[PDB]
Design a protein around this ligand. Structure first.
Ligand SMILES: *CCC(=O)Nc1cc(Nc2nccc(-c3cn(C4CC4)c4ccccc34)n2)c(OC)cc1N(C)CCN(C)C
Length: 266
């Protein structure tokens, strides 16, 4: 099927500039769009591969590409996510994240990944750092630099044979949920990356997070099966976490539980 996605090229005089470079700015084509601008031939060839992917996806739980600017430096312009990556957010707000937010985030990430699977697209880098927060009630998947290596998030098949599937993304989804349920802990913290391949082969997995019932930890374990086709599908993960979002305290035990956004500029 032909990929009739549009690549928008923006004037540099429309922007008015966060991490290193990514910047916070406004895009004024009477409308002001809060945006994030990201400034050798290797660098330009890879950032255009990323713009190709983001321009070809359109889903409420996937980061939208607004355009590229062709100046001395190739600049990517995306929707500004004011609350950051989900990894920093869960670390800075542990004392205030409820089970409702955690389970709903798991639903939204699975929806975004299920859409990426419909697009016949493998992310290859699903992680808590690569999930941005529009509002605490709305997250989106980002960073498609490897979307067609971080060993601690990869399936065993990706480590050994460099094989990547939608089901290897499911493994990365399992680690991402584990980062959230541990409020931002580091997977296999301390263990050198060269030893991860031996550990997984022996049968060991990431531990059960303290706030997780066996229901939630069972889903993570299923994402980490050696047999990729035995791991759950993203459409099933949506269904499972959505049921748990209807009674969150039953599955997560936690103590004390003219500016227009890009989503409206279509
Ligand atoms: C964990 C890091 C982070 O996300 N920080 C952050 C982000 C935003 N908004 C935002 N919107 C859209 C895109 C980006 C963004 C994209 N990339 C690259 C890899 C694809 C980066 C890289 C580094 C930073 C940001 C991006 N970001 C914020 O909106 C405001 C605020 C934050 N912070 C919490 C800043 C403090 N961090 C320690 C950097």
């Amino acid at each position: 099927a032909p990929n009739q996605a549009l690549l928008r090229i923006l004037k540099e005089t429309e922007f008015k500039k966060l991490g290193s470079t990514v910047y916070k700015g406004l895009w004024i084509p009477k409308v002001k769009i809060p945006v994030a601008i990201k400034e050798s031939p290797k660098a330009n060839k890879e950032i255009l591969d990323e713009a190709y992917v983001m321009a070809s996806v359109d889903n409420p739980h996937v980061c939208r590409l607004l355009g590229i600017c062709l100046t001395s430096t190739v600049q990517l312009i995306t929707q500004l996510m004011p609350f950051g990556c989900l990894l920093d957010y869960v670390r800075e707000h542990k004392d205030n994240i409820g089970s409702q937010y955690l389970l709903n985030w798991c639903v939204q990430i699975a929806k975004g990944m299920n859409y990426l699977e419909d697009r016949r697209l493998v992310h290859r880098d699903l992680a808590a750092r690569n999930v941005l927060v529009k509002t605490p009630q709305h997250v989106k998947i980002t960073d498609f630099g490897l979307a067609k290596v971080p060993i601690k998030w990869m399936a065993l098949e990706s480590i050994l044979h460099r094989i990547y599937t939608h089901q290897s993304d499911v493994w990365s989804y399992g680690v991402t949920v584990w980062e959230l349920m541990t409020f931002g802990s580091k997977p296999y913290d301390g263990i050198p990356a060269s030893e991860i391949s031996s550990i997984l082969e022996k049968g060991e997995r990431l531990p059960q997070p303290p706030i997780c019932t066996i229901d939630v930890y069972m889903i993570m374990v299923k994402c980490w099966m050696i047999d990729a086709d035995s791991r759950p599908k993203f459409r099933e993960l949506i269904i499972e976490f959505s049921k748990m979002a209807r009674d969150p305290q039953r599955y997560l035990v936690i103590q004390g539980d003219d500016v227009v956004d890009a989503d409206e500029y279509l």
